[PDB]
Design an enzyme around this catalytic site. Structure first.
Site, PDB file in Angstrom:
ATOM      1  N   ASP A   1      40.810   6.612  19.820  1.00 15.21           N
ATOM      2  CA  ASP A   1      39.146   8.143  20.519  1.00 15.21           C
ATOM      3  C   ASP A   1      39.447   8.589  21.626  1.00 15.21           C
ATOM      4  O   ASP A   1      40.034   8.534  22.359  1.00 15.21           O
ATOM      5  CB  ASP A   1      37.717   7.014  20.483  1.00 15.21           C
ATOM      6  N   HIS A   2      39.384  10.137  20.973  1.00 13.66           N
ATOM      7  CA  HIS A   2      40.252  11.181  21.673  1.00 13.66           C
ATOM      8  C   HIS A   2      39.644  11.339  23.490  1.00 13.66           C
ATOM      9  O   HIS A   2      40.548  11.764  23.748  1.00 13.66           O
ATOM     10  CB  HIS A   2      40.967  12.262  21.033  1.00 13.66           C
ATOM     11  N   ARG A   3      38.151  10.640  23.464  1.00 12.36           N
ATOM     12  CA  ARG A   3      37.251  10.752  24.520  1.00 12.36           C
ATOM     13  C   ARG A   3      38.120  10.381  25.553  1.00 12.36           C
ATOM     14  O   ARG A   3      37.577  11.048  26.835  1.00 12.36           O
ATOM     15  CB  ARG A   3      35.963  11.203  24.039  1.00 12.36           C
ATOM     16  N   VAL A   4      38.873   9.253  25.898  1.00 12.27           N
ATOM     17  CA  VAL A   4      39.253   8.134  26.430  1.00 12.27           C
ATOM     18  C   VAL A   4      41.070   7.780  26.343  1.00 12.27           C
ATOM     19  O   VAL A   4      41.123   7.316  27.601  1.00 12.27           O
ATOM     20  CB  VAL A   4      38.012   6.611  25.718  1.00 12.27           C
ATOM     21  N   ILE A   5      41.337   8.229  24.994  1.00 16.55           N
ATOM     22  CA  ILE A   5      42.543   7.967  24.935  1.00 16.55           C
ATOM     23  C   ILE A   5      43.320   8.801  24.518  1.00 16.55           C
ATOM     24  O   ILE A   5      42.996   9.205  23.927  1.00 16.55           O
ATOM     25  CB  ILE A   5      43.018   6.865  23.887  1.00 16.55           C
TER      26      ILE A   5
END
Lengths: 204, 204
Positions: B113-117
């Site tokens: 997930d690119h929003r957090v990692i």
């Protein structure tokens, strides 16, 4: 061969007497006596009398073999030729000769009186000389006399480089000497072996 | 994957809980518990709740790699592909592959997930997994837990057959075990080493 006062060379035959009662050490001493006295002019009339058999060396100069003459009083004369490679190998590499397993040879001749010695006897004589120069017992006797501590090199055929490689075999020889070489070392100032004690194996 | 009463297959994800407090022996036990209970229908509601990270194995069937979907609640899913030779080597001889030094590979994927990692973190994660599977300390820890008496095989590059031949090296290994192999033998019925005494070298 002793040169004269004028300069002209003149060969004469001197005798090593009672040779059938000598070991190699005794034989070597007797030989070098005759050669010594000849070089300082102290040979007598008795030194030139009573020869039974003779030896000549054409191989010194490089002759391959000779057919020499036999003087009255004797039955045979033996001649020793050159100890070189044959002429067909005299321009080959040391590397290529080493690969194949080519050795040097010596040619020996026998000239005999046919009224008293037959051909079969002369052939048997040369066969015995051939066997002796390759024989274990012969080289054991010479080494014993001259006090050489090692075992003599033995006669064998060249073996092929198959199975265990020859490099592996040379590395196993280095390990043997580093481990067990003390068993044949010049450590005793007497020539003494205690007869009671058992002798360890050192074939390795 | 557990088959239903009808016959149709239906995959569901069960959880090994509190994994950050386990050694390899503890981890192996926990794993085999979940697999055992699934095969005899004794998983509860609590077994299916609280997953933080997931692992899938497409390589079982022989897929090279996949791009899988990420379920809500988690941050990453890791996928393990096939452990075969590449397709360009699948018709070559065992002899020719052995000569060159061609190994088998495994491909591993990370879907996040690119929003957090961020991407740099995902790359660093896969680099650490690569290092661990070739690391001395990692394989020491596993062997210790399972009680394997030998030293693990180490990672190294293939060396050329130059200098001392490789056959000579294999013969030196046979001599080492015949001489010094008793130093690492399963002779003590206790897992005991006397701390006072010095430990002999057995790198040979």
């Amino acid at each position: 061969d002793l040169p004269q006062k004028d300069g002209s060379r003149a060969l004469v035959v001197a005798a090593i007497k009672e040779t059938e009662k000598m070991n190699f050490s005794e034989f070597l001493a007797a030989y070098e006596d005759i050669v010594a006295r000849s070089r300082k002019g102290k040979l007598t009339m008795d030194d030139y009398q009573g020869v039974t058999v003779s030896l000549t060396n054409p191989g010194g100069i490089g002759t391959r073999h000779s057919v020499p003459r036999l003087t009255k009083g004797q039955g045979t004369i033996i001649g020793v030729g050159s100890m070189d490679y044959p002429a067909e190998f005299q321009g080959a590499s040391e590397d290529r000769l080493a690969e194949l397993g080519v050795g040097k040879l010596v040619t020996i001749t026998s000239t005999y009186d046919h009224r008293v010695i037959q051909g079969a006897v002369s052939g048997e004589f040369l066969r015995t000389m051939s066997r002796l120069l390759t024989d274990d017992s012969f080289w054991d006797e010479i080494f014993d006399a001259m006090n050489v501590p090692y075992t003599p090199m033995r006669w064998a055929q060249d073996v092929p480089n198959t199975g265990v490689d020859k490099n592996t075999r040379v590395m196993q020889l280095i390990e043997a000497y580093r481990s067990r070489g003390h068993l044949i070392a010049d450590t005793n100032p007497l020539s003494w072996v205690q007869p009671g004690m058992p002798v360890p194996d050192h074939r390795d």
